Design a protein around this nucleic acid. Sequence first.
DNA 1: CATGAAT
DNA 2: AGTCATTCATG
DNA 3: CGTGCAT
DNA 4: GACTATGCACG
Lengths: 695, 690
Amino acid sequence: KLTPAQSKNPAKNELYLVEGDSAGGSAKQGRDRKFQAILPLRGKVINTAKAKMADILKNEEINTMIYTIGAGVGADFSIEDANYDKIIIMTDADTDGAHIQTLLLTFFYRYMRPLVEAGHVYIALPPLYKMAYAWTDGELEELRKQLQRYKGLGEMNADQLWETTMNPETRTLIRVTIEDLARAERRVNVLMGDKVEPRRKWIEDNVKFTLEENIQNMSLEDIMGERFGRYSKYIIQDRALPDIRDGLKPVQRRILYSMNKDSNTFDKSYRKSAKSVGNIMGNFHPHGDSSIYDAMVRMSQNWKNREILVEMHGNNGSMDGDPPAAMRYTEARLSEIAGYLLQDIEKKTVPFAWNFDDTEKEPTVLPAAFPNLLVNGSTGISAGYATDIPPHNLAEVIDAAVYMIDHPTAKIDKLMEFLPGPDFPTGAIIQGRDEIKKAYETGKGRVVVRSKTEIEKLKGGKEQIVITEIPYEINKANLVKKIDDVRVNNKVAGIAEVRDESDRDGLRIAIELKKDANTELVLNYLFKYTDLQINYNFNMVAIDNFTPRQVGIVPILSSYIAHRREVILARSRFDKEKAEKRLHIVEGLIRVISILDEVIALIRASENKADAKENLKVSYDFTEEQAEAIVTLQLYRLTNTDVVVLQEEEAELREKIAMLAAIIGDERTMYNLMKKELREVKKKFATPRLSSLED
Amino acid sequence: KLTPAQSKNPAKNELYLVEGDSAGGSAKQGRDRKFQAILPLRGKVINTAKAKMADILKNEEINTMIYTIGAGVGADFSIEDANYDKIIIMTDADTDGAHIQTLLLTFFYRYMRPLVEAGHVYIALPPLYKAYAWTDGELEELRKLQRYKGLGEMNADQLWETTMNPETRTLIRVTIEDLARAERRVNVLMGDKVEPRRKWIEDNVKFTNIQNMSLEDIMGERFGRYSKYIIQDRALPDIRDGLKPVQRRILYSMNKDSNTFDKSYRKSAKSVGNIMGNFHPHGDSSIYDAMVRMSQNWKNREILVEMHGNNGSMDGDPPAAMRYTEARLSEIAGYLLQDIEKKTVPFAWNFDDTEKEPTVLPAAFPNLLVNGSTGISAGYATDIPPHNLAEVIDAAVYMIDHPTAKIDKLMEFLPGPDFPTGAIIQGRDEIKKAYETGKGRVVVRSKTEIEKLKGGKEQIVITEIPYEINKANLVKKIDDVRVNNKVAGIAEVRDESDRDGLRIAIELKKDANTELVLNYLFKYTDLQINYNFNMVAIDNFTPRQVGIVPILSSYIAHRREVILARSRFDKEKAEKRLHIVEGLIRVISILDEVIALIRASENKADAKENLKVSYDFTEEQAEAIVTLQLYRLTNTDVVVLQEEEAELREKIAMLAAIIGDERTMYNLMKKELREVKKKFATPRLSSLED
DNA sequence: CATGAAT
DNA sequence: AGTCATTCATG
DNA sequence: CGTGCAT
DNA sequence: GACTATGCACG
Ligand SMILES: N[C@@H]1[C@H]2CN(c3nc4c(cc3F)c(=O)c(C(=O)O)cn4-c3ccc(F)cc3F)C[C@@H]12
Ligand SMILES: N[C@@H]1[C@H]2CN(c3nc4c(cc3F)c(=O)c(C(=O)O)cn4-c3ccc(F)cc3F)C[C@@H]12
Ligand SMILES: [Mg+2]
Ligand SMILES: [Mg+2]
Ligand SMILES: [Mg+2]
Ligand SMILES: [Mg+2]
């Protein structure tokens, strides 16, 4: 993987540690083979503060580093036998680039202090903008007086990378200096160590979620602080955790908003996946195609989502975990229900933002015509926080929300008469009313999920245990192996043979027992020692007001209602303004009919368009907007001189405006709309429970 | 790789040989695990009739079959020690699937005859449309409509009912009707000798519950199908615009998406996806690789695609994946598409029948020669070097004025190939032979230069190398000479190429015959190679070995078609307008009566009918008149309109003349060809020697 | 052995 | 996101 | 261990 | 077109 320099020289030769092969390539070319070596880093580097020193020695990335640098590692580290005088870390100028600098620095610290303490560890700062060339937004505006936003290294040409960051005379480097051995140790541990509590706290103290954001020296304590801070913030807000209102992670939201913009919906032909992904990756989500597709695939799997938001034709995976077809084979499109998440988006009902390009606005949250967060759930791993929200029956969640709208201050006990608990797509049995309450109240709670079973008598006095429903998030294939392993190992007596018998229209696992076999002894052992029964831990974290918040039912349902409120208000203002303008025009038209000839005469007498309008104003007191409409009518309209039809539209419009004003100017009338609409969604999408409950 | 059947049973168990892992998945899903096993084939099976039985034994796909079959191979083959009653071959219902069925059949014939002779080899017949239909006629019956482009697009539940269910599926049972009449066909289609195949293709291929089929007949409808496709719609360029179908789609799609040289770069993945979705129904990787190649200036004399980012190097290291790179058409590429919006070129339906695509581009310049092509199908192949834009055009221009121009004269304008990697081309005679018959072997030699050093030691400095030669591999093979001391003299080998220059230095030892060495490297490394012309293209839907003349005539013919087409289009436009403008000028003469007649009309339709009947306006005019906006009624100036009426009449005159006068037309075609030359002309890179 | 659209 | 093997014609 | 967006 | 390792929190 190493691309050596032509000659050796432990005094001039540099070692660029590049993020990714493709960038490691553009570097191999742009470099100067005389003294600049290249060593690509494929993937995120192993955290040498958490992983066991055993898994560390086995990591190819690390071992090949301790070698090429050539000076051993840790205690047996002689700074004299090194091969490079400068180790330059070069990553994308993105958040994941920051994460890498972090993971790396904690390594050159722990197992190569000497190297960093000597100021031999630098950090290449690639340019962010290119008009022109500038690093800070400030240097930007200056070049505009005298832009290709670089989202990564793979975007720039070789002769581009050399001139801007690779040329020792034209580049800028943040030389890592250890200014305080003590204040640097505590800084690294808090961020990279095992303990999670401290790290979570440190983020809560330093990271401001509510607000925004030639070689120069910089402390490790300060460097590790700045970098990990960024990666922290970004991963928390814009990656791992769902928005409390629409229950979507940014990637899922873009997949939907994109597919919808491209008219790729349930009422229309399937569109090839590779085409959907590509448009998403080029307009909204600047990340690996594979991730985008994987995300899109999951939204389509009915054994992971209680209400799939994407319909996909072809091999889209299975409960056995076997891989789905690549994006070149599959077709896809939004499910009908997903359409309800996007309802009214064209009506200015949601806060939009700019995309990485700055070429197109994207929604920060979707209108959500139903409480997606609870219905489909989420999960759920970031930095300092994590989330596991289970799926819920669409109807129940709605019955709850509708209640809470009439009773703002409802307690959990009353809500649970509507929302008894989770409803897994995979069905099965949920035990633990108490812990459910605890979860619905605090966000955390441990429940038990047990497989749905049944006994079948067989010839020869033999019995047979049959499993027809398994626990959420459990791999059928592996479960079957683990059970068969019980038999093979004889950890419990009486298992004759295991057999996955499920087919395209039914799940079925037959655990055939032996002649004289205690089928109760077996069924119990399996529940306890395999995943026929498991623990599900509610850990409901979500993003509220830009910050990660551990939340229960109340905060969720209220944040939703809140949101729906803003949306319906906005929607109603939009539709009113439209009806006002149209009402205005229709009013003018009805006048025009009574003076048709005069108006034609008056336009004939006019010199041009503008003059016609002034005459229409001065002579008949029409408004600008009314004159503009009259003057631009096509001649044939003079054949449709029918006032009663117009008067019907006038009336229909006044009424529409009345009802919209009522919504806008009265909170109760608005809340009734929410209820009316929520019930409609309920009637149209309602479906029976799949998971039964037990206490 | 195998997914086995629950219970072992030689009497009922079926073994599905599926094309691809993806389809292999959908199969495991919609299958009946009781007795149906699955075995994916990852890539084209190895031709067990062309390759050595040595490399044939070291084949994973082949081994796991001999193992999964469980009857061994060759002569040590017991049909009683098998594992399946039926061995089903299940591929896509496309051309490449057909080719796969062909490869697996020559294996089961050459190394498991008894299995085939026992009618145990079948072939699944997936549906082609969807009620489901296999025949284009069985659809019309269901008319009283999706098109499967592969197994992937089929949900596992549909797969079962239509092609996997023994009680609902259709199977072609392979049977050897004549062992002697079938030995020839397999030997000819899959043999090592080309000539017999080429001919077979010529003679037969016309470029224009279960059922038994012979091995002879089954190997025909299949290889015949694949041959025709890989020839017309894959490996070989159209003789006119010099593009293969993939490249044409890449350009056309990108162009339709407005992803051009004068606009911001678009993400590669976004383009590729749009291509694969609307036009080219194949791998996104291939499509990308093609797009990338069209952007590499050491492989194209005139790049058609500009691509920001790591698109590769002469060292041949991989380009950034399409997730990283952005791209757009080059300005010259624009000229390949020039006038495409003016119905100047034959369109057809895409695979999806949802959108039309062009079958050839207008080609405002002779791409086929300028950029070349290459070049491997079935029974045919192609190698066409790139040429100097200016030179090719000079020839075309001359041949326009002198249709029957001899090649000797044409070579005063088009002296020979002009590789973008420069270097030295040797063989005036062979160059002619090539321009004359389409074949010819020329020599390409690296641009060398000696540099004396300090100590009586010289040094060889290469500045240019042979087209299609990997710089990194060359430098290795040269250094291998030094390491092996095949010839004495070489001191060290240094690739000293930088971002702005190509330089390989071969330092020599003191008192070392630097002639002997340079000669050895020319012979035993790619410092010097033979380039073989094999100019094959597609003319009138068929492959044709051609020379400089047919190529240039085919071009000129085409340009004629385009220019004629383009002119009819612009003329029809000017006409329709001029026609409308006549009515408007008239209307003004009778404005009040016309408003009156509209005011008296019952509706739009009635108003037009009144205009025609009472004032003799035409439909087109009544529509224009009746959809005027009221404010028009303010105007009464006829002069401005008359000026437009004049301008249009002149444009129609000139355009008509181009269509009625062959000379006026050719003049035009020359005029433009020259503008292109003046705009994109560049100096020679390769030097010529005899 | 490479080449370049394919699986 | 690189890597691995095969087709086809050709010298 | 294995989850799901990232590299 | 599958395979291969990492981060991050959590039982
Ligand atoms: N020593 C470690 C190399 C890198 N490995 C994997 N890389 C994957 C992936 C999977 C890997 F095992 C991906 O799945 C992926 C993607 O975009 O989906 C990108 N990559 C990926 C590949 C290269 C790279 F530089 C960065 C990446 F994120 C494993 C061994
Ligand atoms: N025994 C041989 C399998 C197939 N291998 C490769 N496959 C590639 C590719 C490269 C391979 F080495 C590709 O490059 C590719 C593509 O679309 O670009 C598709 N494929 C590809 C992979 C799997 C498959 F089923 C069909 C394919 F075309 C290697 C081992
Ligand atoms: Mg990046
Ligand atoms: Mg991946
Ligand atoms: Mg196919
Ligand atoms: Mg490939």
